[PDB]
Amino acid sequence: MVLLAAAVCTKAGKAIVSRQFVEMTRTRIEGLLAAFPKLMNTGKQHTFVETESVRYVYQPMEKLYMVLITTKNSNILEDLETLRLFSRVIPEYCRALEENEISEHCFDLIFAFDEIVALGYRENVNLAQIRTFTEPPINMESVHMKIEEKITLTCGRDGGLQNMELHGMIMLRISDDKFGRIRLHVENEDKKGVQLQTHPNVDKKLFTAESLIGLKNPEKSFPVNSDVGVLKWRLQTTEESFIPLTINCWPSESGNGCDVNIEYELQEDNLELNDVVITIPLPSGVGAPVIGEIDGEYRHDSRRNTLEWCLPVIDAKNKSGSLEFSIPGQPNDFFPVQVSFISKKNYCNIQVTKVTQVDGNSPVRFSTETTFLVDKYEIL
């Protein structure tokens, strides 16, 4: 409700007919209408006048007031507009306003009021609607490739893959004299999801076996967006993407308290991830936690209602904690845990097999680097 009541008044000192959308203003309706509409709603021949902390909108018709009352307001135009539509509907029922004829068509008017303003929100009405109801440097030549990717994952406790998707691009920065043709060879990709974009100056080659892409690179750095998958794409992490982390969550009911063990697994031991954090949520009746972890720091945070474990760099590792809970209610379902991580590989598995350049002698592929970042990575 914003609109307390929609009311037709006689300034005889009583609300002649009126509508209470939901039980609130019963008897209240009559006293307001009876005092205030007598004074012209205390108006001066102004449509808005407010008295005793209630907004009264009105129009005089004879010894009668057609009145809209609100004590809250959403918009200027609106309050008038419901009153106005009401004023098209009221002479159809009662041939202007007049207490005896208003009285006789209590049902008509009242029904219109419910229809016009429903639970205090100003709906619209019309006389036809109403009817249904009442019916040169090449020494320098070098090339660098940077594959930046983000992976997203939703997984069950069971380890169900659910949905995943990798987003990425491979940027190339090349210092090469002349205009050299380059051929790029990459692994073959599949994607449950979809998206691939190719930079201009990218040509597609058809070969009986293997796929190839060739292009003259712009100098400096540019998104390759080569052909093949492209060097600008959304691939599905689902399609052959590796999820650097798998979290195995074992919640346990210690009884009054709860013991949670969180298992983190990384890919090959040799590779190390960085900026890893595991966010393990906790229930509202927290008490306090005791957490233990071999590597990194772990801290419980109230407010957040989550325990956050941070590890600068990890070959791979795990954490455990015991929680104390007051037990209101019954058991609560767990919310998913999320992780942030950085890995020096792409888990879209993009591999740059070979980029051979022509128009000249061998350039040096000084470096190829891979930056892998976590997107929305969630596991229950």
**Could you say whether residue 265 binds its own copies (CB under 8 A)?**
yes
301 closest CA partner among 277, 274, 334, 329:
277
Distances (CA, A) of 70 to 5, 7, 168: 7, 11, 55
Q: How far is the CB of 133 from its own copies (least distance, A)?
A: 56
356 binding its own copies? (CB under 8 A): no
Task: State yes or no: residue 21 binds its own copies (CB under 8 A).
Answer: no
CB of 264 to its own copies, least distance (A): 6
For its own copies, which residue of 83, 85, 145, 213 counts as binding (CB under 8 A)? 213
Nearer to its own copies, 4 or 339 (CB): 339
206: contact with its own copies by CB under 8 A: yes
Q: Which residues have a Cβ under 8 Å from the Cβ of 147 and sit 6 or more positions away?
A: 168, 169, 170, 171, 346, 350, 352, 368, 369, 370, 371
Q: Does 124 bind its own copies (CB under 8 A)?
A: no
Output DSSP code: residue 210: S
Which of 176, 226, 178 lies closest to 200 in space, CA to CA?
Answer: 226
**Which member of 50, 240, 263, 275 binds its own copies (CB under 8 A)?**
263
Angle between helices 106-116 and 76-94 (to 10 degrees): 150
Q: Is 210 in the site for its own copies (CB under 8 A)?
A: yes
* CA distances in angstroms from 279 to 52, 267, 301, 302, listed in the order given: 54, 20, 10, 13
Minimum CB separation of residue 329 from its own copies in Å reads 16
**Quick one: which H or E segment has residue 33?**
helix 27-35
| Segment near its own copies (CB under 8 A); pick from 90-98, 144-152, 246-254, 343-351 | 246-254
Query: Measured on CA atoms in the order 196, 371, 271, 162, is the torsion positive or negative?
Result: negative
| Least Cβ distance, residue 203 to its own copies (angstroms) | 4
**Shortest spacing between CB 217 and its own copies, in angstroms:** 14
If one asks whether residue 62 binds its own copies (CB under 8 A), the answer comes out as no
**Rounded distance, CA 181 to CA 251, Å?**
57
Q: Which of 258, 276, 314, 355 binds its own copies (CB under 8 A)?
A: 258
Query: Is there binding between residue 209 and its own copies (CB under 8 A)?
Result: yes
Q: Binder to its own copies among 46, 72, 205, 354 (CB under 8 A)?
A: 205
Among 47, 154, 175, 261, interactor with its own copies by CB under 8 A: 261
How far is 280 from 327, CA to CA, in rounded Å?
A: 19
Among 69, 109, 170, 337, binds its own copies (CB under 8 A): 337
48 lies in the binding site for its own copies (CB under 8 A):
no
Q: What string of DSSP letters covers 142-192?
A: EEEEEEEEEEEEEE-TT-----EEEEEEEEEEEE-SS--EEEEEE-----S
**Residue 205: other Cβ atoms inside 10 A:** 12
Q: How far is the CB of 123 from its own copies (least distance, A)?
A: 49
Q: How many residues bind its own copies (CB under 8 A)?
A: 39
CB of 319 to its own copies, least distance (A): 9
For residue 217, what is the DSSP state? Answer: P
Residue 369 and residue 187 in contact, taking contact as beta carbons nearer than 8 Å = no
Q: For its own copies, which is the closer residue by CB, 214 or 289?
A: 214
CB 155 to its own copies: min, Å:
11
Does the footprint of its own copies cover residue 278 (CB under 8 A)? yes
Q: Which of 42, 163, 318, 349 binds its own copies (CB under 8 A)?
A: 318
DSSP 73-140: -S-HHHHHHHHHHHHHHHHHHHSS--HHHHHHTHHHHHHHHHHHEETTEE----HHHHHHHT----SS
Q: Which residues pair with 153 in a beta bridge?
A: 164, 377
Contact between 254 and its own copies by CB under 8 A: the answer reads: yes
Q: Would you tell me which residues interact with its own copies (CB under 8 A)?
A: 183, 203-214, 227, 246-255, 258-265, 278, 280, 318, 320, 334, 337, 379
